[PDB]
Amino acid sequence: QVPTRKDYGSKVSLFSHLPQYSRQNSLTQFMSIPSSVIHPAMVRLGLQYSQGLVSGSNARCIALLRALQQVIQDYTTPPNEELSRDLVNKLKPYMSFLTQCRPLSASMHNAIKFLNKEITSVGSSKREEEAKSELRAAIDRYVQEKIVLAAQAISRFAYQKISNGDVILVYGCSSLVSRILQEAWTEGRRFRVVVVDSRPWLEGRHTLRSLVHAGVPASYLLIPAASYVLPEVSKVLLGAHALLANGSVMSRVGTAQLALVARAHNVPVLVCCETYKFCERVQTDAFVSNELDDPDDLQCKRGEHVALANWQNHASLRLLNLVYDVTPPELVDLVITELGMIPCSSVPVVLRV
Amino acid sequence: CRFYQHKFPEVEDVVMVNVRSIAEMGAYVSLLEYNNIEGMILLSELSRRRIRSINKLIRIGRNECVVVIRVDKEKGYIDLSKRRVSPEEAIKCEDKFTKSKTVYSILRHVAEVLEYTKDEQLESLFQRTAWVFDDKYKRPGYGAYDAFKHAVSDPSILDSLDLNEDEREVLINNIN
Amino acid sequence: MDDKELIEYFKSQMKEDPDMASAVAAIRTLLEFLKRDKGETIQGLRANLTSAIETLCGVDSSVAVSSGGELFLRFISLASLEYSDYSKCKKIMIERGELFLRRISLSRNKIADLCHTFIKDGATILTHAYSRVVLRVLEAAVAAKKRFSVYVTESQPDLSGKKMAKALCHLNVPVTVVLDAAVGYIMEKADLVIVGAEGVVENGGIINKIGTNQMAVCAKAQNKPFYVVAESFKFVRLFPLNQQDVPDKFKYKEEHPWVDYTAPSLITLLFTDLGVLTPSAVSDELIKLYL
Amino acid sequence: GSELSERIESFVETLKRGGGPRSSEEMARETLGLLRQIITDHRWSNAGELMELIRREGRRMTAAQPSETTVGNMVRRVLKIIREEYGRLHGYAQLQSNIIEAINELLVELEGTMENIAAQALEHIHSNEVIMTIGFSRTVEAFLKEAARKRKFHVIVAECAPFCQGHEMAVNLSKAGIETTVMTDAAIFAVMSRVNKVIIGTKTILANGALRAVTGTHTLALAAKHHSTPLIVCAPMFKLSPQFPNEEDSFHKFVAPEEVLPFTEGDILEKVSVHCPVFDYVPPELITLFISNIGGNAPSYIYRLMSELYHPDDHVL
């Protein structure tokens, strides 16, 4: 049915199942530009996902959610069909088009699944205007107590931990973390901050700015240099893109590496991840859920003879930029969330019920 | 801005209070309908289920009406209850809250127009005037109630305080 | 009624009873205060007990007493108070309090006949201090007519192990008082280590007298399984990450700690009157129970 | 009502000697059946009397052959069911009907267990990868030859040296065309480098997350923890039992010492005692994944279900 994202890249063997899409072969080349079969706000969101414009995890969440906000508020029902079914329907191909233009993390998975459970949990009696309005209000309460309250709560809770003088490690664009760090520094506690970042999507500069423009003495260096700062940093402070079944954590291509080395030099491991992130599947391995992004956005600048521009053009070549890795609970010490400062291997229970 | 001629409310008074800070034995509830009356509230049974509940920091400030089971003045608290209430009394407390807000904006515009830099003296003048205007109707702080009832055509009852025509001016203006 | 008699009453209670761990003596004197509060309120009594517990914490530097205070504060408002007069409340409240007394008394016997079947016969038990609960659970396992030895450390700052020996050999058990600094030596030859605790942290590890942690670490490297006993109330909502993190309201009484912490990575089996546990289960149980 | 007693005997005997029934979930099913008969062929003044009776019976059951405590936990869960019913519906007589449905409910859920696990398989094992297994654990034959219909990979099956118990699965996966291999347990560490995630059976799940496994498993899990490749326990949740390892070390089915050193060997059997434990321990701290009826789970997770499945006040039974 839908125009199909054209698989790009000599897909490596051990990662064939998950696809290597890209951002040059735009998905909107084929679609009937009249946004009838495909809602206009949802499709504008889908596009500015493909272009990788929105990155932040809960940021991508709020984005999708306000997009479906618009959809609902301008949605109308077919003649004589109960809303709590054809709405679920209409959402389905939109979710599919999303997964096409940009794979969907467990965050937006939990989001859309909750929204479906809400849609269906109200029956025929829904008057169109009042139905759409109640959905607006429920989406509101959702975003409120899941991403603009959970944040402040996590911070107001973790603040008690950060002592004086103890420089702290962070990994990148984890907006939540930056909020914690600021709302901490503004309370008298003092500390430096080291930031760590990785190719290709050099990013910590997001957090680097959002820190220094709040007046915290900072420091920043690529991830393979981790071992040079680990004998000094006293508490790591990661981000997280999901909490899985066993109790692990998932995050960007790095975070497992830093978890490992920082376990090695005996510096306690923090993680900060708000409830609704918490998915329910498990991943002991690190290779069966990873949203491979483009190859040819990998390379860097050497003189001008960028060593890979002829990417497919060889025979054997097979690139990859894995996006998510998973720290097993064997390393992560403390996962701060609004529910408490729970320990890692005890997450799935207290977040299941 | 004090509360009323009842600076220390008596029993069965269902104050419209917010939850200043979630606590252990019970959420410390604070209100301004008694000039910042602060006490506890007996944590309910399914509120003993507030362990796995979400964000005890969220839902801190979202005020609601609660009855005052116990009372104290020197001990300085109030035990408000919520589970055993009715929404009709909630609408009545909403009316009393609209009256409270009206009187608060009134005292603010007094402090501005009548330049009453003093707090206790101006607030006592206002409270005495409100009790005068009220005890004939005996509703909860019926001063401003009668003020807006007669202010359609006769708010001249301000003659007793011929101290600032800006008072009745701002009243009859911000009203309509 | 004032704070003077409260503190001195705690002192008297602990003096007429060194056999009652500081926590329960505190909670007792606390109930005593609640009796003669001579107040008539609900929150005005919460403030009283909070202040009193603050004083008791500022007198005795144990985690046990302050933690028990927290838990008592919890277990006076556990379900609907049935707020009716702010006086009959006190009656039902202190009733639940004396029930709390009941469970706290039962704690030891419960944990003993819960554990004394965990000691395979003919092995060396390596305690660490004058852990009343450890002494009791041993005493039990002996009463079941078993055979096993005892190595006790001496927890240098104050002679604890000497006291534990002097009171255990009264049960006629093979006893040997190592010099606590020597733990690394006898760690080769004892199979499993029961150790008394003085407070459980919310991720599973325990907090205990000076040497615990290092003993702990030794008794993990050599795979020698590692036990621990602690009844209910010594759970605590304190989550350190480094031995420097444990609050300093505990660490004192030149500069030398008295208590310190062990990561739950090491503790292999709890013992709680709530039942056998698994440190993460201590977390789950703490978040649930505490309320 | 003595026919109940005779069926009780028939079981208790077939139990008390050796392989019977040669399937585990079967044992569970015949168990539940006999329990249903205990209920439907008896009455009680108050449900406390039935709790008492089924506790006596379960005592006989587990005490007879404490090496296979499956039925122990079946009678545990039945005690949970009656506890729950007398809790709800008296917190009196017709509730017998109530009880029965619960059994069926439990029963029918059991009938899906294997197939449930099937659905997980197609996720984990990405094709052309190497998985290690020790035994003929039916659940794992289900697992693999139900994830060998969309992919292809390589499973090496070790062999419990007592039996050929790790060969029947080789011949089965041959009958399923997966190109699997056989090997001798002593060589698992030999090839443990070229494994990806060991998939092991299990025979019980203690309340410590410590699984009592078919022998030759402690070494497998230890080699795993060494190489840090993860452990895939194919444990349906009914196989739980709220035992906590350390009691009396009636712990390993000591089978006929005839197995290791057969009797053909002369006189040397006069000062040579023998050991042959078919069931070994594995410490929980090495577990990674409890693939189960409700998807992925970790060691600690297990006591949660032990929180909910069996009422704690009856592990002394």
mmCIF file of N, CA, C and O in Angstrom, chain A residues 14 17 245-247 280-285 287-288 330 345-346 348-349 352-353, chain D residues 123-124 126 129 197 225 228 230 232 288-289 291 294 296-298 300-301 303-304:
data_model
loop_
_atom_site.group_PDB
_atom_site.id
_atom_site.type_symbol
_atom_site.label_atom_id
_atom_site.label_comp_id
_atom_site.label_asym_id
_atom_site.label_seq_id
_atom_site.Cartn_x
_atom_site.Cartn_y
_atom_site.Cartn_z
ATOM 1 N N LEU A 14 24.997 -10.136 10.459
ATOM 2 C CA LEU A 14 24.500 -10.356 11.809
ATOM 3 C C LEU A 14 23.412 -9.359 12.203
ATOM 4 O O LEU A 14 22.820 -9.501 13.278
ATOM 5 N N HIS A 17 17.898 -8.575 10.053
ATOM 6 C CA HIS A 17 16.489 -8.501 10.425
ATOM 7 C C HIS A 17 16.006 -7.062 10.511
ATOM 8 O O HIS A 17 14.953 -6.723 9.962
ATOM 9 N N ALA A 245 12.620 -5.946 30.544
ATOM 10 C CA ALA A 245 11.994 -6.907 31.444
ATOM 11 C C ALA A 245 12.945 -7.392 32.527
ATOM 12 O O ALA A 245 12.638 -7.253 33.713
ATOM 13 N N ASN A 246 14.079 -7.980 32.145
ATOM 14 C CA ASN A 246 15.000 -8.537 33.132
ATOM 15 C C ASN A 246 15.360 -7.506 34.193
ATOM 16 O O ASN A 246 15.487 -7.828 35.378
ATOM 17 N N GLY A 247 15.494 -6.257 33.778
ATOM 18 C CA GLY A 247 15.940 -5.210 34.659
ATOM 19 C C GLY A 247 17.087 -4.403 34.116
ATOM 20 O O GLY A 247 17.632 -3.566 34.838
ATOM 21 N N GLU A 280 8.241 -3.603 28.426
ATOM 22 C CA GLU A 280 8.011 -4.876 29.089
ATOM 23 C C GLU A 280 8.732 -6.075 28.484
ATOM 24 O O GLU A 280 8.815 -7.110 29.152
ATOM 25 N N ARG A 281 9.264 -5.981 27.271
ATOM 26 C CA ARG A 281 10.002 -7.105 26.718
ATOM 27 C C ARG A 281 11.376 -7.200 27.377
ATOM 28 O O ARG A 281 11.763 -6.356 28.187
ATOM 29 N N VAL A 282 12.136 -8.235 27.014
ATOM 30 C CA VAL A 282 13.461 -8.465 27.576
ATOM 31 C C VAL A 282 14.480 -8.555 26.451
ATOM 32 O O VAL A 282 14.158 -8.882 25.308
ATOM 33 N N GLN A 283 15.729 -8.246 26.792
ATOM 34 C CA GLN A 283 16.822 -8.387 25.834
ATOM 35 C C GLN A 283 18.099 -8.677 26.622
ATOM 36 O O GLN A 283 18.800 -7.759 27.047
ATOM 37 N N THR A 284 18.396 -9.964 26.795
ATOM 38 C CA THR A 284 19.661 -10.348 27.410
ATOM 39 C C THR A 284 20.825 -9.996 26.505
ATOM 40 O O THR A 284 21.832 -9.442 26.957
ATOM 41 N N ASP A 285 20.698 -10.315 25.227
ATOM 42 C CA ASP A 285 21.710 -9.998 24.237
ATOM 43 C C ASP A 285 21.655 -8.507 23.932
ATOM 44 O O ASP A 285 20.930 -7.739 24.570
ATOM 45 N N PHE A 287 21.703 -7.501 20.358
ATOM 46 C CA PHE A 287 21.718 -7.539 18.905
ATOM 47 C C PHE A 287 20.365 -7.774 18.254
ATOM 48 O O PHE A 287 20.311 -7.893 17.024
ATOM 49 N N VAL A 288 19.274 -7.839 19.020
ATOM 50 C CA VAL A 288 17.981 -8.189 18.437
ATOM 51 C C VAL A 288 16.984 -7.042 18.462
ATOM 52 O O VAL A 288 15.849 -7.208 17.989
ATOM 53 N N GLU A 330 23.892 -6.270 35.740
ATOM 54 C CA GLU A 330 25.115 -6.661 36.418
ATOM 55 C C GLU A 330 26.023 -5.476 36.711
ATOM 56 O O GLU A 330 26.975 -5.619 37.483
ATOM 57 N N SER A 345 18.333 -4.255 39.518
ATOM 58 C CA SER A 345 17.759 -5.594 39.350
ATOM 59 C C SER A 345 16.417 -5.761 40.041
ATOM 60 O O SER A 345 15.877 -6.871 40.064
ATOM 61 N N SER A 346 15.869 -4.689 40.609
ATOM 62 C CA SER A 346 14.544 -4.707 41.207
ATOM 63 C C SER A 346 13.576 -3.790 40.475
ATOM 64 O O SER A 346 12.514 -3.461 41.009
ATOM 65 N N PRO A 348 11.805 -4.370 37.382
ATOM 66 C CA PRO A 348 10.609 -4.798 36.644
ATOM 67 C C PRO A 348 9.407 -5.026 37.525
ATOM 68 O O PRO A 348 8.274 -4.774 37.096
ATOM 69 N N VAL A 349 9.616 -5.481 38.756
ATOM 70 C CA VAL A 349 8.498 -5.722 39.654
ATOM 71 C C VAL A 349 7.785 -4.418 39.989
ATOM 72 O O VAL A 349 6.607 -4.232 39.662
ATOM 73 N N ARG A 352 5.951 -2.973 37.132
ATOM 74 C CA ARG A 352 4.945 -3.751 36.426
ATOM 75 C C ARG A 352 3.544 -3.413 36.920
ATOM 76 O O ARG A 352 2.672 -3.024 36.136
ATOM 77 N N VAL A 353 3.312 -3.557 38.222
ATOM 78 C CA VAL A 353 1.977 -3.409 38.797
ATOM 79 C C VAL A 353 1.392 -2.025 38.529
ATOM 80 O O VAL A 353 0.571 -1.852 37.625
ATOM 81 N N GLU D 123 11.822 -14.790 18.377
ATOM 82 C CA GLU D 123 12.442 -13.498 18.642
ATOM 83 C C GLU D 123 13.943 -13.627 18.897
ATOM 84 O O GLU D 123 14.752 -13.017 18.191
ATOM 85 N N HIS D 124 14.324 -14.418 19.901
ATOM 86 C CA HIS D 124 15.686 -14.354 20.424
ATOM 87 C C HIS D 124 16.714 -14.768 19.382
ATOM 88 O O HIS D 124 17.556 -13.968 18.965
ATOM 89 N N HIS D 126 18.620 -15.133 16.486
ATOM 90 C CA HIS D 126 18.848 -14.745 15.106
ATOM 91 C C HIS D 126 19.654 -15.826 14.396
ATOM 92 O O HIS D 126 20.486 -16.509 14.992
ATOM 93 N N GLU D 129 23.336 -18.799 14.178
ATOM 94 C CA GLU D 129 24.097 -18.634 15.408
ATOM 95 C C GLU D 129 24.118 -19.932 16.204
ATOM 96 O O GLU D 129 23.354 -20.857 15.913
ATOM 97 N N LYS D 197 24.448 -18.091 23.241
ATOM 98 C CA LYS D 197 23.663 -18.048 24.463
ATOM 99 C C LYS D 197 23.160 -19.453 24.742
ATOM 100 O O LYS D 197 22.335 -19.985 23.995
ATOM 101 N N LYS D 225 29.070 -18.000 32.826
ATOM 102 C CA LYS D 225 29.474 -16.847 33.621
ATOM 103 C C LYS D 225 30.900 -16.435 33.316
ATOM 104 O O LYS D 225 31.193 -15.240 33.218
ATOM 105 N N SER D 228 30.790 -15.015 30.091
ATOM 106 C CA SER D 228 29.731 -14.023 30.235
ATOM 107 C C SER D 228 28.692 -14.081 29.127
ATOM 108 O O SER D 228 27.977 -13.095 28.927
ATOM 109 N N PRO D 230 25.022 -15.394 27.966
ATOM 110 C CA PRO D 230 23.874 -15.459 28.872
ATOM 111 C C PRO D 230 23.192 -16.823 28.897
ATOM 112 O O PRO D 230 23.327 -17.641 27.986
ATOM 113 N N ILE D 232 19.785 -19.135 29.161
ATOM 114 C CA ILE D 232 18.397 -19.133 28.722
ATOM 115 C C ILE D 232 17.715 -20.319 29.392
ATOM 116 O O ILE D 232 17.764 -21.449 28.892
ATOM 117 N N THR D 288 20.523 -15.530 33.698
ATOM 118 C CA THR D 288 20.220 -14.296 32.988
ATOM 119 C C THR D 288 18.745 -14.163 32.653
ATOM 120 O O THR D 288 18.145 -13.123 32.937
ATOM 121 N N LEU D 289 18.132 -15.193 32.078
ATOM 122 C CA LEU D 289 16.792 -15.036 31.537
ATOM 123 C C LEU D 289 15.925 -16.236 31.867
ATOM 124 O O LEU D 289 16.276 -17.370 31.529
ATOM 125 N N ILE D 291 13.089 -17.286 30.444
ATOM 126 C CA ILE D 291 12.083 -17.465 29.409
ATOM 127 C C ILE D 291 10.969 -18.315 29.972
ATOM 128 O O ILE D 291 11.210 -19.404 30.497
ATOM 129 N N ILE D 294 5.287 -15.958 30.668
ATOM 130 C CA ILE D 294 4.972 -14.538 30.593
ATOM 131 C C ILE D 294 6.185 -13.750 30.114
ATOM 132 O O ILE D 294 6.393 -12.603 30.522
ATOM 133 N N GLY D 296 10.266 -12.723 29.179
ATOM 134 C CA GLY D 296 11.517 -12.547 29.891
ATOM 135 C C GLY D 296 11.436 -12.217 31.362
ATOM 136 O O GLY D 296 10.584 -11.431 31.783
ATOM 137 N N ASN D 297 12.311 -12.827 32.159
ATOM 138 C CA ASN D 297 12.390 -12.570 33.588
ATOM 139 C C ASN D 297 13.804 -12.853 34.075
ATOM 140 O O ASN D 297 14.514 -13.686 33.507
ATOM 141 N N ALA D 298 14.194 -12.162 35.130
ATOM 142 C CA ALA D 298 15.526 -12.207 35.707
ATOM 143 C C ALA D 298 15.496 -12.904 37.057
ATOM 144 O O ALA D 298 14.426 -13.147 37.615
ATOM 145 N N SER D 300 15.991 -12.179 40.354
ATOM 146 C CA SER D 300 15.182 -11.593 41.417
ATOM 147 C C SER D 300 13.697 -11.714 41.108
ATOM 148 O O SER D 300 12.898 -12.092 41.977
ATOM 149 N N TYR D 301 13.324 -11.472 39.853
ATOM 150 C CA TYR D 301 11.935 -11.519 39.424
ATOM 151 C C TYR D 301 11.224 -12.729 40.003
ATOM 152 O O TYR D 301 10.031 -12.666 40.318
ATOM 153 N N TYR D 303 11.110 -14.369 42.813
ATOM 154 C CA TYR D 303 10.381 -14.433 44.072
ATOM 155 C C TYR D 303 9.080 -13.663 43.991
ATOM 156 O O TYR D 303 8.153 -13.957 44.753
ATOM 157 N N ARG D 304 8.980 -12.715 43.060
ATOM 158 C CA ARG D 304 7.704 -12.063 42.825
ATOM 159 C C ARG D 304 6.617 -13.101 42.610
ATOM 160 O O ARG D 304 5.585 -13.092 43.286
#
